[PDB]
Amino acid sequence: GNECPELQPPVHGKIEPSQAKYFFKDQVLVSCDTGYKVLKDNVEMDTFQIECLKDGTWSNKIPTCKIVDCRAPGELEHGLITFSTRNNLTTYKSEIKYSCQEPYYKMLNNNTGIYTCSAQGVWMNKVLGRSLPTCLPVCGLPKFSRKLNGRPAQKGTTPWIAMLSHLNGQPFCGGSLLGSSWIVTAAHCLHQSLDPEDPTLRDSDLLSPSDFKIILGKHWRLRSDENEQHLGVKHTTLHPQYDPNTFENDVALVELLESPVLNAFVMPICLPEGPQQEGAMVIVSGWGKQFLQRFPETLMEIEIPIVDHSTCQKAYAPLKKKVTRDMICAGEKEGGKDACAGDSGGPMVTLNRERGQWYLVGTVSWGDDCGKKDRYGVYSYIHHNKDWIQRVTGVRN
């Protein structure tokens, strides 16, 4: 030998140790700059080692430096990936952009959604870092308009209402879609009538996810739509302080087994962000006979004002029925037939201007027999238990 030829550092790389002349048994590591790695026969490596042989030749040839590949970006549920070039580059320094599926979803915290391929082969966002953005369900924004009591509801104007039916489709309660997977309803909808001689709620009384289903995007009471989504039930949670005899905290939460596809006919209703006032106008909807002579063919609605707590209590006091602070009343005049509005668990909503958003004020309560509640319509004051609901479902407006 015994000297080996001068070595050429690869592009975007280097060689160590850097000697003026190399002689037998000398060794060198070939490495690459930040964002690049050594490429030897399609195997990536931090360094590759060469040595000077006795005959004066190097053990191998200088490999090359290949740019790092962040590979395929993480999937954003309800979101979209938009590359910053027509070639969809997933390599070092390249960028992509996450966008939520408008208008049915919006990005949480309005994160830029921009991710860059880092030197360590990971897509990184300035704020979240490695974590992906969150696409939230847009609530209370109906896509169909209102033509402008008692009256059949216009198709598409109540995309949040849920029908709690038997496995065959027979309704027995109402409900509202919250977030992506939750149905808020009345606690007394989720258990069989208790024994008058032993009025205590027990687990066997509760009905199971196998006993009923949820139907969304439904307009006709008995007829079928193409918009109807029949979903199975996963689990149910009645309010911890639900009293089936006084109907205190008569609110419950149904976790759907599979989530509905959000569209022009199926969207969640917004949670309350503040208490309601006396005289405030609300809308109550349902499929029951309600204030009608006979059962309707389509969903029904009625715009009625809120009644101040006190006046309600006073009207029910002579009947030994205590209207608790977790309850809200509505209607026009006591015994005015509009105290029978809605189905148990059904929604009571109102408009938040100029937010142009609808939100849930209460759920129909005190049972499905209006004779036992003819003074005023009593509902589970959602505002009162917003914390528990938000705590359990993890839902945000």
Curated annotation (Swiss-Prot):
Presence of keyword Magnesium: no
Highest taxon above the source species: Eukaryota
Domain annotation Peptidase S1: ranges: 149-394
Activity control, per UniProt: Inhibited by SERPING1 and A2M.
Main localization, broad class: secreted
GO CC entries: cytosol; extracellular region; extracellular space; nucleoplasm
Membrane-spanning ranges: none
Positions of the catalytic residues: 188 (charge relay system), 250 (charge relay system), 344 (charge relay system)
Location within or outside the cell: Secreted
EC class name: hydrolase
Modification comment: The iron and 2-oxoglutarate dependent 3-hydroxylation of aspartate and asparagine is (R) stereospecific within EGF domains. N-glycosylated. Some N-linked glycan are of the complex-type.
Keywords of the record: Autocatalytic cleavage, Calcium, Complement activation lectin pathway, Disease variant, Disulfide bond, EGF-like domain, Glycoprotein, Hydrolase, Hydroxylation, Immunity, Innate immunity, Metal-binding, Protease, Repeat, Secreted, Serine protease, Signal, Sushi
Function statement: Functions in the lectin pathway of complement, which performs a key role in innate immunity by recognizing pathogens through patterns of sugar moieties and neutralizing them. The lectin pathway is triggered upon binding of mannan-binding lectin (MBL) and ficolins to sugar moieties which leads to activation of the associated proteases MASP1 and MASP2. Functions as an endopeptidase and may activate MASP2 or C2 or directly activate C3 the key component of complement reaction. Isoform 2 may have an inhibitory effect on the activation of the lectin pathway of complement or may cleave IGFBP5.
Disease: 3MC syndrome 1: A form of 3MC syndrome, an autosomal recessive disorder characterized by facial dysmorphism, craniosynostosis, learning disability, and genital, limb and vesicorenal anomalies. Facial features include hypertelorism, blepharophimosis, blepharoptosis and highly arched eyebrows, cleft lip and/or palate. The term 3MC syndrome includes Carnevale, Mingarelli, Malpuech, and Michels syndromes.
Name of the protein in its database record: Mannan-binding lectin serine protease 1
Species assigned in the record: Homo sapiens (Human)
Organism phylogeny: Eukaryota, Metazoa, Chordata, Craniata, Vertebrata
Gene: MASP1
Entire protein: shown range: 298 to 699 of 699
